[PDB]
Design a protein around this ligand. Structure first.
Ligand code: ADP
Ligand code: CA
Lengths: 375, 116, 68, 116, 68, 116
């Protein structure tokens, strides 16, 4: 009590459920968003199976599990299982009840209207939550990084968002939503692996791809020039003894899948690279508002952690684009967790009161209290 | 500032020493206390020669005066290398199981001097 | 005679696990020497790469000044 | 043998938490119940227990092989600890000592409900 | 009866040689775990240093052109 | 724990001895009773120096402190060897005709300490 109220900081997506205690800086409790059943039948008696297996408990013992995925970048295949995903957050890891402290979540811009009330209903009209809010993904990282004037491109795993926020919100738009990040690359690898007697089919092993990915996979400085270099067996082939029992000397499999990012043609979409749409969104704004945008670019998310992601952007943009101001790309120490660094802030602020929703406020405006307060 | 017109520190020391012994802080204990301050002084001889690695906006942090930087790590009795890597580059990844460090990237000078 | 078989059988188990352990232990010991050598070698190269990129650091800097 | 104390505790919360006189941190929304503990209602008061031991503590099973070595002793003292087989308590012999506890208390009440 | 005494003399010899090996084998495995940890660590740094010098030389090349 | 702040065992003994004789437990009988407890104490000085025979998972049971192990078998008046073989390695084969023992194989430490 005294000078302590304790506020939770959560940020869920399509890869990790980031959570902490109170006033923290970095995410303490983290676990994969998974929830399946026992295709096997639990021994059924050596426990009335139930618990789909979740948290650092399901990922530990995959194989047996029939992992089913609820949140495919935005759309939720089913909300009934979501109840048993949040039953793992506050209870197992955080070890605190939601009927005590507030709550903070993230908002993927342009989210279905039906999802607003559905989510809020799960808490207030069921699991008593005194107060909560659902802040907008990107905007959070802006302040934490210490930027006032920037163009943000937040992309962790779910979807891509080109948010030219550098002074205010809710203008025309200059924002886009693309389903081409993280999990999209995870499903693409197994496709091409078939050309080398490898086929990670189901979800259980599909997760292993993610593991092997974040330890060697890279983005070619220039696919065209590295083609002739492929002859050399030093900078391409990299041994990786699968901790299960298989040696895969990945060489041309590391920078072939990530290429899909710049080449949406490899997934059947007329959409251009992420540097074309960048122009598309900037041109719809004022004319005297660009010179400062190019000066400072905010690239956050785990997608920017790959080796050979920032340098390439400074090669293609400068080619066909205004060439007067300095070109600089900002990549903070841990540009992935930049969202959580800023997420913790708003939760620890007091001015935040004149924004969130209070217990009584809901009953005063009914279920439409959401779109009546926030937007 | 440094020198004060009303206070005479040089002549006060030997007078304080008697007061130091009055409580129970013998020379043996005195020396042990001076090390703690010496550690602070060693930190005080450590600034950041604004590394000119970056060419324009942002900038990294590098220590040209290794003599002073080494003096601290020497008395702190810690790895000079790890000290420079861990501080200049912050680590974050504490997923309950409890952390995996070292992942990072340089930051501006203001934040470096601030964290310092 | 039966007790003899029990102990004699244990001797076979002891001798088997001994030659097997020592055989792999010797192989492991020899492997460690190879890995240790590789560690020392790689560490040496990393040192040369570190001092080199640090030389380009003071080089790209002075060149930026002359250009300005 | 593998169903540890933790697994057994899970069998209680699911099989029950519906029948009167039982609660926990899952069903009953109450932080007062630790994740490693559970609530149990009595005839009036409430009590929270720990699942430490439970099995190995209650089982206390000792079959022949180990006992047989002691029963065939020549010393009058050692064999004394192993009386000539079941003294006024035969029935069946092998079935843990934990379940035998219940039998000892049940045999107690049976002879209590047959007098004045 | 005599053979029962002789057979035991060989048993203890194999047990000790196996235990002595296991003692060092475990130590070597632990050492290997530490070395391999730094091996990939230095390899990661070496790869990073290699990436740095490549970008430096590229930028320096541009600075030279602008200087001329 | 061992010592209690409210109870004085050292000074209570000689007082109890009078009560021991009050019933009919003369020193001759007292000594006979202390042996039974001494047997329990000898069992109490017997643990299992986790035999490192197995290299990884499972593990056997071996007694390095033979002094303590022998002390028990000495007072129990039984074959120290048979005691170690019969207990550490359980026997089963009772086909009505009534058993043929000794067939067995080592087991983990938890079960050993449990059976103990
Ligand atoms: N150092 C890294 N390099 C490349 N990918 C990384 C790195 N660290 C994390 N990732 C990846 O980033 C993704 C998680 O990023 P995150 O921003 O938390 O996603 P989301 O918010 O969509 O759940 C995972 O696919 C993970 O493997
Ligand atoms: Ca993100």
């Amino acid at each position: 009590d005294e000078d302590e109220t304790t506020a939770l900081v959560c940020d869920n997506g399509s890869g990790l459920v980031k959570a902490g205690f109170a006033g923290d800086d970095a995410p303490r409790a983290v676990f994969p968003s998974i929830v399946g059943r026992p295709r096997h039948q639990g021994v059924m008696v050596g426990m009335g199976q139930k618990d789909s297996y979740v948290g650092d408990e399901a990922q530990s013992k995959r194989g047996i599990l029939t992992l089913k995925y609820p949140i495919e970048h935005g759309i939720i295949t089913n909300w009934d299982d979501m109840e048993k995903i949040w039953h793992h957050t506050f209870y197992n890891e955080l070890r605190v009840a939601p009927e005590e402290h507030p709550t903070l979540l993230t908002e993927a811009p342009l989210n279905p209207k039906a999802n607003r009330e559905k989510m809020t209903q799960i808490m207030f009209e069921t699991f008593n939550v005194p107060a909560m809010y659902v802040a907008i993904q990107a905007v959070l990282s802006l302040y934490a990084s210490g930027r006032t004037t920037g163009i943000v491109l937040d992309s962790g795993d779910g979807v891509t968002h080109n948010v030219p926020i550098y002074e205010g919100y809710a203008l025309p738009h200059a924002i886009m939503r693309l389903d081409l990040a993280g999990r999209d690359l995870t499903d693409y690898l197994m496709k091409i692996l078939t050309e080398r007697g490898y086929s990670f089919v189901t979800t259980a092993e599909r997760e292993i791809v993610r593991d092997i990915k974040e330890k060697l996979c890279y983005v070619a400085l220039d696919f065209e020039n590295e083609m002739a270099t492929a002859a050399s067996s030093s900078s391409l082939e990299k041994s990786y003894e699968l901790p299960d029992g298989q040696v895969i000397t990945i060489g041309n499999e590391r920078f072939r899948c990530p290429e899909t990012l710049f080449q949406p043609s490899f997934i059947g979409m007329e959409s251009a690279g992420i540097h074309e749409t960048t122009y598309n969104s900037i041109m719809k704004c004022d004319i005297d508002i660009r010179k400062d945008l190019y000066a400072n670019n905010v690239m956050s998310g785990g997608t920017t952690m790959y080796p050979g992601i920032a340098d390439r952007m400074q090669k293609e943009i400068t080619a066909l684009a205004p060439s007067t101001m300095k070109i600089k790309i900002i990549a903070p120490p841990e540009r992935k967790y930049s969202v959580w660094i800023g997420g913790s802030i708003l939760a620890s602020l007091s001015t935040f009161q004149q924004m969130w929703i209070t217990k009584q406020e809901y009953d005063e405006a009914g279920p439409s209290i959401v779109h009546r307060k926030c937007f | 500032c440094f020198d004060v017109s009303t206070i005479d520190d040089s002549g006060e020391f030997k007078i304080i020493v008697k007061a130091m012994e009055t409580l129970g802080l013998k020379e043996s204990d005195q020396n042990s206390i001076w090390r703690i301050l010496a550690a602070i002084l060693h930190i005080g001889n450590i600034t950041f020669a604004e590394a000119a690695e970056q060419r324009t906006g942002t900038t990294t942090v590098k220590v040209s005066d290794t003599k002073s930087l080494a003096a601290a790590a020497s008395c702190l009795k810690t790895d000079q290398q790890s000290l420079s890597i861990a501080l200049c580059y912050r680590s974050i990844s504490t997923g309950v199981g409890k952390r995996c460090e070292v992942i990072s990237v340089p930051m501006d000078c203001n934040q470096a001097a601030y964290s310092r | 005679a039966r007790k003899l078989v029990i102990i004699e059988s244990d001797l076979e188990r002891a001798e088997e696990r001994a030659e097997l352990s020592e055989g792999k232990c010797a192989e492991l010991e020899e492997e460690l020497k190879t890995v240790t050598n590789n560690l020392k070698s790689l560490e040496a190269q990393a040192e040369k790469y570190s001092q080199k990129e640090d030389k380009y650091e003071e080089e790209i800097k002075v060149l930026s000044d002359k250009l300005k | 043998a593998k169903s540890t104390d933790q697994t057994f505790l899970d069998s209680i919360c699911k099989q029950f938490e519906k029948n009167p006189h039982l609660q926990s941190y899952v069903v009953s929304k109450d932080r007062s119940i630790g994740d490693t503990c559970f609530r149990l209602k009595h005839y009036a008061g409430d009590v929270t227990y720990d699942v430490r031991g439970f099995l190995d503590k209650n089982k206390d099973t000792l079959f022949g092989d180990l006992i047989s070595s002691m029963q065939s002793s020549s010393d009058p003292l050692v064999q004394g600890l192993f009386p000539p087989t079941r003294p006024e308590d035969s029935k069946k012999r092998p079935e843990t000592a934990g379940s035998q506890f219940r039998n000892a208390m049940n045999a107690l009440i049976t002879t209590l409900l047959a007098c004045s």
